[PDB]
Amino acid sequence: YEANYEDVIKKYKPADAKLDRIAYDWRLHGGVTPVKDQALCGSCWAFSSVGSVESQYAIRKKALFLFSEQELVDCSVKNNGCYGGYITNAFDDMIDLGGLCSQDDYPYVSNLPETCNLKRCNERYTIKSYVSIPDDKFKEALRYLGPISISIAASDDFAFYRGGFYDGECGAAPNHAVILVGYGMKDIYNEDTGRMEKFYYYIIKNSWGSDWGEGGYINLETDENGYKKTCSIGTEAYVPLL
Amino acid sequence: YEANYEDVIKKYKPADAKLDRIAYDWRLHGGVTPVKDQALCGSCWAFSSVGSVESQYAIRKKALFLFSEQELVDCSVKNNGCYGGYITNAFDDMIDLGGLCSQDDYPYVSNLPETCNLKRCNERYTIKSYVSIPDDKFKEALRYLGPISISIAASDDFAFYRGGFYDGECGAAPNHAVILVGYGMKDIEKFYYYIIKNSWGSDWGEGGYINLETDENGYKKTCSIGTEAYVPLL
Amino acid sequence: YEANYEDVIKKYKPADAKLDRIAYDWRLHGGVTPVKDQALCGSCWAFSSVGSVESQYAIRKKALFLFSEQELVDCSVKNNGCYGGYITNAFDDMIDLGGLCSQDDYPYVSNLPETCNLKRCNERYTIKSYVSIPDDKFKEALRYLGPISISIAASDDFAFYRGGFYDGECGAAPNHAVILVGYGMKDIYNEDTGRMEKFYYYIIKNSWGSDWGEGGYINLETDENGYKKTCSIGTEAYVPLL
Amino acid sequence: YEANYEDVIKKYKPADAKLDRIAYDWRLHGGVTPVKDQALCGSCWAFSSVGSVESQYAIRKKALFLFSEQELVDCSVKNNGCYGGYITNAFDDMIDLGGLCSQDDYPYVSNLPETCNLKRCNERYTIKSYVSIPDDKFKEALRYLGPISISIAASDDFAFYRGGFYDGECGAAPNHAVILVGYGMKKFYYYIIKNSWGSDWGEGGYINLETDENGYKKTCSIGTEAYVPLL
């Protein structure tokens, strides 16, 4: 079910398109659905992967599609429900299970044990494949493909982040799954330099509710090319395709 | 602080531009920030006004700026916090107070009683003026000026709306404030509608939105939308 | 299905039991279940009535029972869902429908239109009857019968209440339904008469979440007798009976 | 500072009282306030210690008092806010800060950073001292003193518990603070633990953890640290 980026970007980027590397934000272009809250459950892998599919349907279909993380939690045998999972495993099971359910047909119950029951789903929403995004290609992928389901190495500082300029530690190993929804640049005073410097960042959608960070989001530092990774973002990185 | 529509539309509409009256949606074209939730507080006036400014900043500065409704609730002496307010009064106070704060500097605490404290804002974001939009000119104003802060007469049916073709009643008097973010047309008979962004969370309406019937000219109002109607200007 | 207060109190109040009119709080005696949130919906009548039943179950069966307001919203033909209803209508339909469902079998979706489907319920939880509480008997009924489903005249001040000593306006007419869960007394300095004065109060459980009032509760003034009504509480007042 | 158990219990256990080792539940006898929720913040140490003081005030003063965890998170210098703390440090600081605030005066906003401002409080609610409960005195201390603030070794299984007979793993080391609110039996003896992750965790916010009749068996290292505050 995996395609190669090399082939996919040829299809999605227009022939004569020039990438703007300074700023692009899918929140301004109808590509981002409301932030969700995983409550007390390690289902980040489901929120990341399903949210990336929500975004792809918004972009490609220009309408609001809200899907069920609970269905993956209950039915994705390749993953471990609230005990954790993988981005690739999740997309594989989206395909093999016959698609996602709407959020209203299959509502979220977090750590409450629930049997898998797809007979509760009326309509089903499939993806065709998914594509791994190379670490030197995040801005291009984000601009032409859409938001990216990414791993992140989250710390306690990240857990307790309530907005403002992030100065926290990163985790050792990737331990969380979030979504990249854009990039930007602002002028920020640089204390090791003693003046205003360009500060490039990726915009990350988390799944800990809109009371975490900045409306559920965080800006993490990158560079103009967008190769620099803060907290190991996108070590695993995939966009779902219709 | 109020400018005139005839002058403003001259500066903003390119010469020889022709208006597409069928459809135009600012969510697609960089002009709409996510939906917020006022919680158990009657601060709709703050959300409508501040949201129209977020939309202008997006359109003119090409990045997402999130501003503080709580600052207005707390510090807008011309309004009454959670007990209600007015669109014009809210824009006047944004000007008189020295501008908006960021959402992160001054976070939303709804009906929690809280004193004005502008010391906690670092950067500030002003508007120069605002313009009243004539009722016969909403599509023109949306397309060339941007999202409009509007009054609406909301009913119980409107409160309980969770998606689909709206066929509920209207309220008896303007009682709420929302934002017009575009217009569209579907074939249902052609059905022309305005796209309204509300401040009751993304689990109201359709992700926080409702389509309200108009006509091709866009003169027809459902729920007395835009009886009061203003775009803020930078 | 309405019983007679006079006959009911004689069965529930022990012989030689003497009422303590100072203080009694069912939250300190295992008779009150968690505060819930009706969200954007006029289903207070269902929160009031179901909550009082949760309380009777807790008191009489000494275990935790959490029931479904959504079932009444969906299925109570004598009420009007999010547009409102009545306490007695609610109890009448609990009986006619064949009992309440658990909260987990039939979760709350507020203003989302939902068909009545009692096949979703596995176990059902009935009541036998209900009794109207006279305005001169609230403390006696609270102590020996239990928490009372009551009407209240809620104003905008009441809506925006976030705790502390209540001094807002009351509404004109009853427009809301809450639960009386107890009564108390504290000594409060009068600014003013320069004397401590006894302040008697009822304890009201609301259904606007834990972030309203004092953990979802409000203390409203009464007198030692408990006859005095603040915000017309208990104009209509009922206890369900197992 | 701390008090001594043998002094405290002789004074609090009535002369010729006899311990019922089978069941005693403070939820029924006027000693437990509603379950709260720490949200996304490691302030369990504050919920535990404050909750035990809410419990003591309820038993001794016979009315429900709600106190401020946020005050301790913001103001306890010996602890590290959302990054964690200790049961003794918490009690020390409520003594040294001059008491707890009402929940109304100093409401909870979890991980949202706030500076300590005690000017927000009118009335203050002090404790006089607190006492450590020996390994072999949980049931006794429970019956005659009240709810105990305790440490617990909580696992992933524990975190994801939503009711029923608990058969999950225990944690490697104590990493959490709860309140013991009683004991019961159904063949099967247990302690009753009040948690601070909302009423939609466990059994309405509670978990029964296996013990024995004397109350010597400890599941999940409960009460490695074990204290009752005193008025």
Ligand SMILES: *[C@H](CS(=O)(=O)c1ccccc1)[C@H](CCc1ccccc1)NC(=O)[C@H](CC(C)C)NC(=O)N1CCOCC1
């Ligand atoms: C989601 C991350 S979280 O729950 O939001 C979070 C947890 C801890 C620290 C910071 C954030 C889950 C947590 C899984 C978990 C971890 C510990 C106890 C219970 C549950 N993370 C994952 O699912 C990651 C995702 C990868 C993209 C890194 N996967 C994962 O941890 N595992 C994969 C399957 O085996 C379990 C381990």
Ligand SMILES: *[C@H](CS(=O)(=O)c1ccccc1)[C@H](CCc1ccccc1)NC(=O)[C@H](CC(C)C)NC(=O)N1CCOCC1
């Ligand atoms: C916001 C709208 S709302 O809270 O979402 C709403 C309330 C009632 C019905 C429908 C929607 C506020 C509500 C103010 C209020 C009303 C009653 C009790 C408490 C609070 N509405 C306003 O602020 C309107 C906006 C205008 C542009 C129409 N203004 C308003 O009602 N007033 C102006 C100031 O004085 C009080 C009245």
Ligand SMILES: *[C@H](CS(=O)(=O)c1ccccc1)[C@H](CCc1ccccc1)NC(=O)[C@H](CC(C)C)NC(=O)N1CCOCC1
């Ligand atoms: C619940 C009260 S509320 O929504 O929590 C509330 C009231 C006042 C201030 C703030 C919140 C419902 C609301 C019904 C409603 C009213 C207006 C518009 C939409 C919905 N109140 C009731 O159900 C009352 C309860 C009685 C015990 C007083 N009943 C009621 O309003 N009706 C009876 C049935 O017909 C409809 C009217």
Ligand SMILES: *[C@H](CS(=O)(=O)c1ccccc1)[C@H](CCc1ccccc1)NC(=O)[C@H](CC(C)C)NC(=O)N1CCOCC1
């Ligand atoms: C509360 C426990 S918790 O956050 O509710 C929790 C535990 C297990 C599973 C899910 C939730 C805090 C956690 C503090 C913390 C730890 C790691 C990362 C972020 C925050 N635990 C404590 O405060 C314990 C209490 C003892 C009685 C065990 N103490 C503690 O962790 N520390 C002592 C003071 O310095 C920091 C470490």
